[PDB]
């Protein structure tokens, strides 16, 4: 329950969350691949846009992020809106609600155009400001699952581009997708936002890093590449959440 999961999340720590992000999560592997075949500014813009349309997918989120990375590798992208207008109808894994998704990309296009490499650096040092900027450009509540998720994925892309790590702000709540919501119901009747913020504050692990611990495992990622000390902690968590 809450007490035991906060203890184990605390023992895993931001250190353990970062290991999972940078070594286990296939989505980071996909981003690393894309980073080697498109310029850094476009890479970061594309990752934010892709996050904001990563919902009502088909198949598995990890397959979608690999499709995105393999598609944009080596492409000459100008308008991100026009790139998604050509990409999404030809997608295997993102075929529903395409006009809705495209209108979201149209709305954030001006904001994305401000992401020079200098500005990307500044935002990685102040991800709370990025969080509000994305929400305001979209015209939505910042608590929205895809908005907080886009901040997480910005942090994946930015650490690759900038060769530095900054932790996600404690105040950014967990992205409430089907994996997180279904797990939360097994554990509690509390709404996931309050539940995981309490665990975050008790453990010292910000909610977006808690997401990195939980979400790959809930999709079936293997923990067997983790070093023994970490792997033993991940196994205790799996027995809790499974
Ligand atoms: N919580 C969460 N959601 C994800 C991840 N990857 C991904 O594609 N999603 C989708 C699910 C959902 O539609 C959106 C917000 O959670 O992001 C991910 O890593 N974590």
Numbering used by the authors: -2 to 239
Reproduce, without paraphrasing, sentences from the article in which this PDB structure was first reported.
8-Oxoguanine (GO) is a major purine oxidation product in DNA. The major way to remove GO is the base excision repair pathway, usually initiated by a GO-DNA glycosylase. While no enzymes with an A/G specific-DNA glycosylase or a dGOTPase activity have been discovered in these species, a GO-DNA glycosylase called AGOG (for Archaeal GO-DNA Glycosylase) has been initially identified in the hyperthermophilic archaeon Pyrobaculum aerophilum. Despite very low sequence identity, AGOG is structurally similar to eukaryotic and prokaryotic OGG1 and OGG2 GO-DNA glycosylases and, like these two proteins, belongs to the Endo III structural superfamily partly defined by the central helix-hairpin-helix (HhH) element followed by a glycine/proline-rich region and an aspartate (GPD).
The residues involved in GO-moiety recognition are conserved among the AGOG proteins studied so far, and we confirmed by soaking crystals in crystallization buffer containing 8-oxoguanosine (8-oxodG, Pab-AGOG + 8-oxodG) that the Pab-AGOG binding pocket has the same conformation as the one previously observed for Pae-AGOG. The damaged base is sandwiched between two aromatic residues (F146 and W212) and makes H-bonds with six Pab-AGOG residues (Q24, W62, K149, P172, D174, D208). The sugar moiety of 8-oxodG interacts through its O3’ with the carbonyl group of S51 while the O5’ establishes an intra-residual H-bond with the N2 atom of the base. Unlike Pae-AGOG, Pab-AGOG shows a change of backbone conformation at the catalytic K142 residue upon GO binding. The torsional angle Ψ of K142 has a value of 128.8° in the apo structure and of –42.9° when complexed to GO, leading to a substantial conformational change of the HhH hairpin. This conformational change could be induced and/or stabilized by the presence in the protein active site of sodium citrate coming from the crystallization buffer.
